[PDB]
Amino acid sequence: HGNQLTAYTLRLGDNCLVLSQRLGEWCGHAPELEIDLALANIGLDLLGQARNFLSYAAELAGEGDEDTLAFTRDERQFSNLLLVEQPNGNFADTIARQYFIDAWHVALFTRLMESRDPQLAAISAKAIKEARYHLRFSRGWLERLGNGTDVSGQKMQQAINKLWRFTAELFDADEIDIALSEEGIAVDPRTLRAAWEAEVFAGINEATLNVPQEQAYRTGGKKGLHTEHLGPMLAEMQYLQRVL
Amino acid sequence: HGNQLTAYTLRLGDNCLVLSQRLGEWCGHAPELEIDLALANIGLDLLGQARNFLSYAAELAGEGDEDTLAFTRDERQFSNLLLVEQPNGNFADTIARQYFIDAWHVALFTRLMESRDPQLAAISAKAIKEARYHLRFSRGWLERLGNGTDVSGQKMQQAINKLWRFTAELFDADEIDIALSEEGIAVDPRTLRAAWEAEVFAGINEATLNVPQEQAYRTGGKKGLHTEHLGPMLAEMQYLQRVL
């Protein structure tokens, strides 16, 4: 059971760490200073939550710390969702990725605040506040791009379409999710789908765009099975740790 | 001659290119937003200078362009001074590195703008203006950190000390320097020491700091012999070219 809790805690931290790294790559390349500052702020919030989760996972494991966990594991040991390791692409692609994960975070942390694990509950109490601001930002830009010129609307629709194949993974429950949720410790991913859709489907329509059709999807992140993008990203992250 | 002019032009381009990438790594990590934007600006100036030099070198070589030069060369093919490939360290370490190269650029371009080579003269004529701003910035921060906190003057002195071993290389002349300077095209590095010392020594003492004592130094950059730091840097550039 200790291993299950460690793995659960670590994957939540991995999601934050990986996304944080992607947002960091935007620094100095955003369309405006305002956007550049917002993305850096979200990345910093995510890095902080990554520290909290990894720190707790190292404690549970009885060895290492947030740094050993963040910088000494190769992709096979990373357990983040595939959605956060995807390339930044254009601003629209980054906005779609952010909105999907932000809506997920708000739903997750809202429920995880009730966790019988006091540390997970405490972390969620702080993360929920950050997630709400992220969502306000990502949903706001989704709306603005979708309601802008048809060209920006097309770019926003395309971003939504290409990243939709990574949304289903957010709602599948594995053995760890099931065991820990029956214990009132973890949130059953399956139970977050309704809240996510209510937010996302509404946001997409209010941006005057279409919700993609459900199709076969990509998965494996929580089991250490990733896309070709994570490896290179981790090498970069580890390098930046050495030089900066 | 053709090969020497190409090598000379490329080396100046490499200095700028390598340093711009290091400054780019400071994005979002500077002490304050103002400093962050300033470093990002210097880096962009340097990247602009790098394009001019590399573009010219590619022309001289009658093959390739700035992109193939910047991205298809391994470390043994790079010709930047060792000082610019050094890690950022803390803000003081970055200020020492910047101040030393800015003083050098001002001394060099002030004279190279009178090169028999019209393209080098033109590039230098534009570069010197930018270089003056860089120097004001770096010297300004040197004076500011040196005369600041006890810990600041301490970190600044340590920054000066650890990078001093990379300053002598800026003044050694090789076969290319000598041949091209005799043709009135290049500036003989040995003749830049006087101006450089007049600037840097004054700045260091004005900052209430001590000029390190000369001793054995590191060199080889100009002929493709680099420290352990360049290889990883190039790998990072390659990565960044792929991701965004």
From Swiss-Prot, chains A, B:
This is 1,2-phenylacetyl-CoA epoxidase, subunit C. Substrate binds at residues 77-80, 178-180. Component of 1,2-phenylacetyl-CoA epoxidase multicomponent enzyme system which catalyzes the reduction of phenylacetyl-CoA (PA-CoA) to form 1,2-epoxyphenylacetyl-CoA. The subunit C may be essential for structural integrity of the alpha subunit. Induction: Activated by cAMP receptor protein (CRP), integration host factor (IHF) and by phenylacetyl-coenzyme A (PA-CoA) that prevents PaaX from binding its target sequences. Inhibited by PaaX. NCBIfam families: PA_CoA_Oxy3. It comes from Escherichia coli (strain K12). SUPFAM superfamilies: Ferritin-like. GO terms for cellular component: cytosol; phenylacetyl-CoA 1,2-epoxidase complex. InterPro entries: Aromatic_CoA_ox/epox (IPR052703), Ferritin-like (IPR012347), Ferritin-like_SF (IPR009078), PaaA_PaaC (IPR007814), PaaC (IPR011882). PANTHER family: 1,2-PHENYLACETYL-COA EPOXIDASE, SUBUNIT C, PHENYLACETIC ACID DEGRADATION PROTEIN PAA.
